[PDB]
Amino acid sequence: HFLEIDKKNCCVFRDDFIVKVLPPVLGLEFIFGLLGNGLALWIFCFHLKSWKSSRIFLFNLAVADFLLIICLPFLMDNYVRRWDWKFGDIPCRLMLFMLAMNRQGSIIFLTVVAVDRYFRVVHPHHALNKISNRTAAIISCLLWGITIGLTVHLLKKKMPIQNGGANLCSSFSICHTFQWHEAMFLLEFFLPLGIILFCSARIIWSLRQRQMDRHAKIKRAITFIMVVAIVFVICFLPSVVVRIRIFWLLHTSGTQNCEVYRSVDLAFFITLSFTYMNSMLDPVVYYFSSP
Amino acid sequence: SELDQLRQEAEQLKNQIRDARKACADATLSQITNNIDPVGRIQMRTRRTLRGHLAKIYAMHWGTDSRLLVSASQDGKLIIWDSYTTNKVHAIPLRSSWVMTCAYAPSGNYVACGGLDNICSIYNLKTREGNVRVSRELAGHTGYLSCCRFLDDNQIVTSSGDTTCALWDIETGQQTTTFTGHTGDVMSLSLAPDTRLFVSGACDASAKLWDVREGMCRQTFTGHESDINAICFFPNGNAFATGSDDATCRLFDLRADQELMTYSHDNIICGITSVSFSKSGRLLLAGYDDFNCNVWDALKADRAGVLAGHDNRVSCLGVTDDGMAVATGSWDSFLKIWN
Amino acid sequence: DVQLVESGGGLVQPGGSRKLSCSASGFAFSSFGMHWVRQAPEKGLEWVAYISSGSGTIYYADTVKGRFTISRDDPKNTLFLQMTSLRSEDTAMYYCVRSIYYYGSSPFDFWGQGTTLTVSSSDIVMTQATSSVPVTPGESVSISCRSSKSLLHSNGNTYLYWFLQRPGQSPQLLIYRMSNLASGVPDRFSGSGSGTAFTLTISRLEAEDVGVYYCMQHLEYPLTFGAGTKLEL
Amino acid sequence: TASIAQARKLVEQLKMEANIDRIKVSKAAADLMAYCEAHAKEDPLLTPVPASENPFRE
Amino acid sequence: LSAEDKAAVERSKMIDRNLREDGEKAAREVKLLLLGAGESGKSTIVKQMKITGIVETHFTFKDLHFKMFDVGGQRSERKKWIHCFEGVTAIIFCVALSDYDLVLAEDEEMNRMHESMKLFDSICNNKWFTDTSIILFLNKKDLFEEKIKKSPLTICYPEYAGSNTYEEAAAYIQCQFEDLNKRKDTKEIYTHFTCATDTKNVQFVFDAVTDVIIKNNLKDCGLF
Ligand SMILES: O=C(O)c1cccnc1
């Protein structure tokens, strides 16, 4: 029906067919992501005898994805029990913060490795290519500071919203208002998408015009740059387009009738799982590749 | 009419010296030392790690205080380390970045260095000013310098890849003696503890024993199958060890003028970059190029232990005069001090 | 030959301000750490301020903290001491002292000529028993100085320095860390000490061996000197 | 005439090297054994030195 | 940690700072190794780029500093010091293309470019040089053009069809020198015919060096 949130008249339902498809999806995600991220972190922690900036950034990406998919199982249980998150108040804040901060970190580090590749390919002699490991550590800590600085507001709020008989633990909710959460999601998709697309296009154009693509290994690198672009789009475009659609019908129509939302809600959360695929799809493209 | 006769005479003399060598080989040191207990497994843990070089490290020498050490590297820098505290006393810039040898004066007042520029240059460490300056720049060798060792504050003897060892006088600046007996490039040097004799290992698979005061080859020791890369005296001074590409060490004796023992293993196939002894002579730290170093029982040829902390091949390693520690440089720009 | 020339001072009204400049050209200045040591008329030496190599570390004495400011200009090889609010007890001869710190160095090696300055009108303390001892030439003489706490450190070396001030001349270092005979002095001098009570021995006196002897600790700042010991032939 | 001089020098060097008196291998083995046993305890690299007497520590 | 030891540690830290500055300044420099038979027009290329021991040549083209080590002055064994140059961006191999009618004075039993062919074969598939690319310079273009009329290329290479023209003979020689590459999956060979204009050779060397640097950067990032 129509619920109520302070200063925000919201309406989010508990429709079925969300506990039969989403829990198995999240189970597969957690299994594969935990396995891949553990087998990736094993090399970095123990049997990697070198480092440098690019491996620093890949290690940070793996750390972010690892924390994300260890955060997954509680969210999986929350989906299983049909929005009945019966853990408390601190667990809600922690899980929402973990999910959002780790997604921001994954996206920011994807963008930064794309920019690193763009500098390494189009401007090989730029001073940013020759960057010290301490400088890389400072830059990565600064990036983590930027990531956290936009997300601590999920710790101040009382996340476990009690309504009717249920305990909602969802940061993504639809309300007749604009908050920094939705806007941050919008830029989270758009601006890194623009940077990644520009970097990939420039890399491809410079490599092809240099006519060095004839090498049997450059072709694999090009196809994996393309692959990383397409997987980024595949995991992030659906949820964002559903958010744009719900913004459109919220602006045009409003919240007078709450029954024009059901569909645009349900698939939304399903699309919301697509980005978690990135966590379980990053190891195959980023680390396990490039022999 | 004369070359053939001289060649036949030389062959006869070689056969005679081989027969004389075989005459005094009634017993063998390898079986004589079955009565003593084995040294057993020996564990050495890297106490320190001197970091700050950013290129290949090709040379290092231990000061007589057994606390300061100089290290050469291909970035053009010469660094004096304090082993106890791992801090840089000095950082000497070099005119040529292609140096492959370095040495420390026994008094600690001077340091030498040389390389592909075929010049062993002496740096004065203790000046009235605050910097280190080039005291002398010796020239006269034809091939790259592989080793120069300080006899004292005034004398130094160098070995170069022009099949020649030379003894210099630092004040005037020119060599006073020349040791031209080798056929291949001379690759290593080792002064006797009493500093009256020294052996040089060349590329002709032979090590020769010279006399500093006279200037003549006293003995020639053969038995290797490749170029000798490492030379080190026994602490007594009546023996020495050789290291070559055939993955084999060899202990020679001056008095009997023949080889005593060989240190070879089936699994080890790569050569040897540097060889040194212990304070008493029971150990033989031979630095191979399989990315680690090995330790041998010098009296029974038994592999006592290994030192496997380097991410590249070790190119130099020496033992402190007091016998406290062992430092090994490698190509990963990393120096490590063991115990 | 190293030199340390300095200019400044000569007369200051109380409560004024004056700047002292030190010039050391032709020899290394960036690597050396520089000190200021003052000596009131007919009184023992007193450390004033210290600046490290690269200007990255600056100390001041307790009685000058807040009123003095020591700075160096390595490109110009100059050392400064901005003095503010000068009292009537600041009248002293100020010395420029160089010191280099690495394993086996000899700090406080060279002292400047010293520039005078007249203003018109917890820490280890040392102790010297006597300030005037007459000894005939050719005889050995021993000078001993104690300390509040033992100067022997975990490093194994005890920090004690010996300086000799000839009549009308700058003090010169002859022994550092109680044992090492500083370069440039004869071998007749020798030093020894045990933790807290130290000494200095001269094999035989000479016409130029008479003067004032000071002993100084370098375990930790502020560096404390000792009362001078005058030797009369 | 360079080859002739080199051959003469090699022959003379070999002749001078031949005359050196050499003791038996067993004698030298015994001497090395005696030296290495007489300095067994003064070898910190051989027997582990106590950490108190070890100038190098972690 | 007394005052003396603290000052010593600060001195060491300053030493580290200066060492890091010098190393980062040196990492911006392209290190090139020049080899060849010695009488293969090496000096001409050296002087074009310029505008005992081992000679050093330094120059900048486009904000990029080139260091070129001329190692031909050493007559010792190559294997005894070739591992010194193991970390090098590229190797320049000047080849003279007008010495098939000339034989080496010392032996006179082998052709002049056959010695350079053996040198190239040894250098290309060395243990240390399994990654460094090789820049090939075929110097005596005009002499080849004016001399191929007198004698054909069949004398140096018996297994030749016998076109006896400059273009096909030059292609044959370039292909023969490229055929010595055994590790075709790790290193490339760049070939240029030395031109009269001195800017073109330097531009080609710059392009080869930037290709090597791009591939190294891709390998470091992982994509290669
Ligand atoms: O941040 C997320 O991905 C999220 C937020 C709320 C509910 N489910 C997932």
Secondary structure (DSSP) of C144-205: EEEESS--B-TTS-B-EEEEEE-TTS--EEEEETTTEEPTTS-TTEEEEEETTEEEEEESS-
Residue E35's DSSP bridge partners are: E93
**For residue C147, which amino acid is it?**
S
Residue C65, min C-alpha distance to chain E (Å): 19
Going by the DSSP 8-state scheme, the letter that residue A113 receives in this structure is H
Q: What is the count of structural domains for chain D?
A: 1
| Integer Cα distance of E54 and E45 in angstroms | 17
Residue with the smallest CA separation from ligand 1 atom 3 is: A99
Residue A8 lies in a domain: no
- In this structure, the answer to whether residues C64 and C96 fall within a common structural domain is yes
Q: Do chains D and B touch (3 or more CB pairs under 8 A)?
A: yes
Which chains have 3 or more CB–CB distances shorter than 8 Å to chain B?
C, D, E
User: Within 13 Å of residue E187, how many CA atoms lie on the same side as its CB?
Assistant: 26
Q: Does domain B2-339 have CATH number 3.30.70.1150?
A: no
Is there a single domain that holds both residue C133 and residue C113?
no
Chain centroid to CA A202: 24
Count Cβ atoms below 10 Å from residue B266 Cβ, excluding itself.
6
Number of folded domains that form chain C: 2
Which residues of D fall within a CB distance of 8 Å from B206? Answer: none
How far is A168 from B190, CA to CA, in rounded Å?
A: 80
C-alpha B302/C-alpha B298 separation (Å) is 8
- A129 to chain E: which residues are within 8 Å by CB? 217
Residues C16 and C107 in one domain: yes
> Which residues of E fall within a CB distance of 8 Å from A216?
185
* Dist. CA B151–CA B141, nearest whole Å: 19
Helix H or strand E segment including E12: helix E3-26
Preceding amide of A160 cis, omega within 30: no
Domain CATH code at residue A186: 1.20.1070.10
Is residue C94 within a helix (H) or strand (E), and if so which, with residue range? strand C93-99
Strands E90-95 and E133-138: parallel
C-alpha distances (whole Å) from B159 to each of B97, B102, B107 are 19, 12, 22
Burial of residue A75 (CB within 10 Å: 0-12, 13-18, 19+) is buried
Q: Is residue C105 part of a domain?
A: yes
Residue of A112, A226, A290 to mutate when probing chain E, most E C-beta within 10 A: A290
Considering the domain boundaries, does residue C16 fall inside one? yes
Q: Domain E1-224: which CATH class?
A: alpha beta
CA–CA distance from C187 to each of B165, C110, C184, C202, E4 (Å)? 39, 19, 9, 9, 26
The answer to the question of residue C1 being in a domain is no
Q: What is the CATH number of the domain that holds C101?
A: 2.60.40.10
Q: How far apart are CA A244 and CA A184, in angstroms?
A: 13
Phi-psi region of A82 (alpha: psi -120 to 50; beta: other; left: phi over 0): left
Decide if C200 contacts C162 (C-beta within 8 A): yes
* Number of CB atoms found within 10 A of residue A33's CB: 25
Element at E13 (helix H, strand E): helix E3-26
Q: Judge contact between E140 and E96, C-beta under 8 A.
A: yes
Verify that C153 and C203 share a domain, yes or no. yes
CA distances from B246 to B163, B243, B266, B284, E76 (A): 21, 8, 11, 17, 21
String of b and e for B121-153 (b: at least 16 CB within 10 Å)? Answer: bbbbbeeeebebeebbebebbebbbbbbbbbee
Q: For residues B294 and B284, what is the distance between their CA atoms, to the nearest angstrom?
A: 8
Distance from CA of E18 to the nearest CA of B (A): 9
Say how far apart CA B29 and CA A31 lie, in whole Å.
64
What distance in Å separates residue B299's CA from the closest CA in chain E?
Answer: 31
Cβ–Cβ under 8 Å, residues E119 and E136 = no
Residue E55, strand partner residues: E70
B/e letters for A210-232, b = 16+ CB within 10 Å, e = fewer, are eeeeeeebbeebbebbeebbebb
Judge contact between B111 and B105, C-beta under 8 A. yes
Find out whether E142 is annotated in a ligand binding site: yes
Rg of chain B's alpha carbons, rounded to an integer? 20
Q: Which helix (H) or strand (E) holds B219?
A: strand B217-222
Going from the Cα of A224 to the center of ligand 1, the distance in angstroms, rounded, reads 29
**Which structure tokens are listed for A101?**
């901060």
Together in a domain, C110 and C138: no
Helix (H, G, I), strand (E, B) or coil at D35: helix
* Residue A103 CA to ligand 1 centre (angstroms): 10
Tell me how many degrees the CA angle A85-A91-A93 measures, rounded to the nearest 5: 105
Do C and E touch, 3+ Cβ pairs within 8 Å? The answer is yes
**For a substitution probing ligand 1, which of A172, A179, A273, A275 has the most ligand atoms within 8 Å of its CB?**
A172
Residues on chain E touching C103 (C-beta within 8 angstroms): 8
Report which residue type is found at E104: L
Task: Give the CA angle between residues B121, B96, B62 to the nearest 5°.
Answer: 50
Domain ranges of chain E: 1-224
- C13 with C58, same domain: the answer is yes
B329-334: which pairs have CB atoms within 8 A and are 24 or more residues apart?
B329/B57, B329/B58, B329/B59, B329/B60, B329/B71, B330/B57, B331/B56, B331/B57, B333/B51, B333/B53, B333/B54, B333/B55, B333/B56, B333/B57, B333/B73, B334/B49, B334/B50, B334/B51, B334/B53, B334/B57, B334/B310
Burial class (CB in 10 A: 0-12, 13-18, 19+), E154: middle
Cβ within 8 Å, pair D25-B258: yes
| Record: contact B238-D39, CB cut-off 8 A | no
Count of the separate structural domains present in chain A: 1
In which order are the strands placed within the sheet that holds B164-169? B145-150, B155-160, B164-169, B175-179
Residue C150 at interface with chain E, using a CB cutoff of 8 Å: no
Query: Which residues in B38-76 are b (16+ Cβ under 10 Å) and which e?
Result: ebeebebebbbebebbbbbbbbbbbbebbbbbbbbbbbb
C112 plus C132 within the same structural domain = no
Range of the domain at C141: 126-230
Same domain? C86 vs C179: no
- DSSP sequence for B267-322: S--S-EEEEEE-SSSSEEEEEESSSSEEEEETTTTEEEEEE---SS-EEEEEE-TT
Q: With an 8 Å Cβ cutoff, are D25 and B319 in contact?
A: no
Cβ-based contacts of B139 with chain E (< 8 Å) = 52
Look at E80 and B139 and tell me if their CB atoms are within 8 Å: no
Contact B210, B255 (CB under 8 A): no
Calpha distance E156→E147 (Å, rounded): 13
Instruction: Quote the ligand 1 centre to A141 CA distance (angstroms).
Output: 25
Residue C222 lies in a domain: yes
Beta-carbon neighbour count of residue C109 at 10 Å? 20
Ligand 1 in reach of A184 Cβ (< 6 A): no
Does residue C88 share a domain with residue C48?
yes
Please give the angle made by the CA atoms of E135, E136 and E139, to the nearest 5 degrees: 135
Expressed in angstroms and rounded, the spacing between residue A73 Cα and the centre of ligand 1 is 12
Q: Specify the ligand 1 atom closest to the Cα of A276.
A: 3
**Block residue for tokens 């760049």:** E190
Measured CA to CA, the distance from residue C213 to residue C215 in angstroms comes to 7
The whole domain housing D30 covers 2-38
The answer to whether residues C72 and C147 belong to one domain is: no
User: Among the residues of chain A, which ranges form H helices?
Assistant: 22-42, 52-80, 90-122, 133-149, 153-156, 180-209, 218-252, 262-282
**Ligand 1: nearest atom to the Cα of A100:** 1
Helix (H, G, I), strand (E, B) or coil at B198: strand
Residue with the two structure tokens 């830290």: E13
Provide the Cα torsion B200, B203, B206, B210; round to 10°. Answer: -20
The count of C-alpha atoms lying within 13 angstroms of the C-alpha of E3, restricted to the half-sphere facing its C-beta, is: 21
